[PDB]
């Protein structure tokens, strides 16, 4: 299963990157694969929708009045635009907390454009600027709602992180021992499980959206998953920002799916049932997860866009909005194109 | 074969990177290896000392009076610091040329601290700020020295580029057809050849400097290689810049080797004869070349340092100057250590 994305200079191989991908149905049955579809994989921020679920199922969180844009921010790895920071502060007021209560730190923006502004300003990013700030405020919310004490909401012994750990395992349909945990850049526990289970999570998100839309009776959990899908698709700029893959991908598909970046080159997508999914051989929703073995983001976005093409998800029209991600520009300092990106991999079913 | 450098988060595999490496003696004989030591590889800026050789061997260049720091800038991927721009301009004045004669383009500095300062200032890098500006001024020089005309010094049909292609193949001991050619970021022809041959080039640099130091007869080309090594070793800040691996590596070793980065994560080192190289089983200078298959520079610097330590080159003292390249920091936004870097490969030897 030698599946690669490859860059060339004048047709000479520059770099090559090993690709893993899983394509699963709404129960997580594996439908297509690249590389090792069960690779044990840190999901990183691609697990944010499952953290958002653990927040939304925390009793009393409903009392704070978070809106859909708020929930989308809980699912986000945002670009620290002024609207993201403003929303972080506004969410903190809702729970009568302060920036001092966050246990996440500032960092250079995920948007080069934002970061340039910051440099010109000599702006020092603080906790509320964290790309994960929405998820931390959600967790603080949960901690206050159960009377747990906000100190250490971010540590594994805290009930808020016990709810995350349980929720992740449940969504993956794994025993607790089959999920491993480390600590992320924003100082939260972050899960590792087989790659296909990441796609299983996103298949469940889209499936719940399908059930909601069709008027089907739903469990509290399904209803909440459907609320999360709608939040992300309706406010995709909260999930990332202007110019960001996730935001442009989700705007292009106009509610048809959701997508989320995980750091070090993971990606997950949840596709509502359609002609395309039926053509692929399932009668429900579908889930896609991808990992680039070496962590290269640019190659990741190329592969995800190629993968959608090969699955016939969308249209040439929809997917063209992502063209600059699909075939990255390889132009030298004098305006000369010096190479390209190719995709020597083969989907197996 | 499957030789990897692996990052982890809490002991959980995060990313893994395939490593190719060749360690060769002064004639290119292969001594140790990782991965595919003959991987067809674009050498990128690791080829710039071969380009300086072609420059220095061009009829009439000697009369411009380039000095050792000038030659070091020819061999460089510099950080575009003010001193690199000043030396680029000084070199243009040696050949009576202008910035408008350069055929390379500006780019974000290879240095984050320089680049931040540019952004703070709204500075737009120009031709003269290119990391290869030294090489471009040397190819301009050679074209003017033989009356070839400054326009098009960068094109493959130009006798300056004809001389470069010839010099590269000769240093690799390869036939012309065994070298492939693309175009680089700085708009020059750039070569590709088996990875071990990049190490062969750098063993020749180190062997030439040994023979010059011992004062045996030397070809004009061996004399020129010994000069390139000396210039790189004496002005390593010109080869890269403050804080840069190549500068800190050559400084630490104090003339015992030269080292040079290739874009998309190739590396080459040339090692003078030593108690270490004699312990490695060869009676002369040594060449090391490395390619990280996926192009990660952070992983490259980590692996090269691990390689020197495994090979016994330097002392634990010398190499401790490279400690934060050997094991890159893995500390999150709150000061918590979240992971690390390991080197689960074994060097194979024959
Ligand atoms: Cl981290």
Author numbering:
A (entry chain B): 4 to 352
B (entry chain A): 4 to 353
Paper passage:
Asparaginases (EC 3.5.1.1), which split L-asparagine to L-aspartate and ammonia, are grouped into three unrelated structural classes: Class 1 (bacterial-type), Class 2 (plant-type), and Class 3 (Rhizobium etli-type). ReAV is a homodimer with an α/β protomeric fold, formed by two tightly packed domains.
The substitution of Lys138 with alanine caused significant structural rearrangements in the active site region. The absence of Lys138 affected the position and conformational states of Ser48 and Lys51 from the Ser48-Lys51 tandem, disrupting the H-bond network in the active site area, as well as the conformation of the cysteine residues from the zinc coordination sphere. In the four protein chains, the metal site was filled with a water molecule (w1) bound by the Sγ atoms of Cys135 and Cys189, and additionally, in protein chain C, alternative conformers of Cys135 and Cys189 form a direct Cys135-Cys189 disulfide bridge. Moreover, as shown by ITC affinity studies, the K138A mutant is still able to bind the zinc ion, albeit with lower affinity (∼26 μM) than the WT protein (∼3 μM). The low zinc binding affinity explains the absence of the zinc ion in the crystal structure.
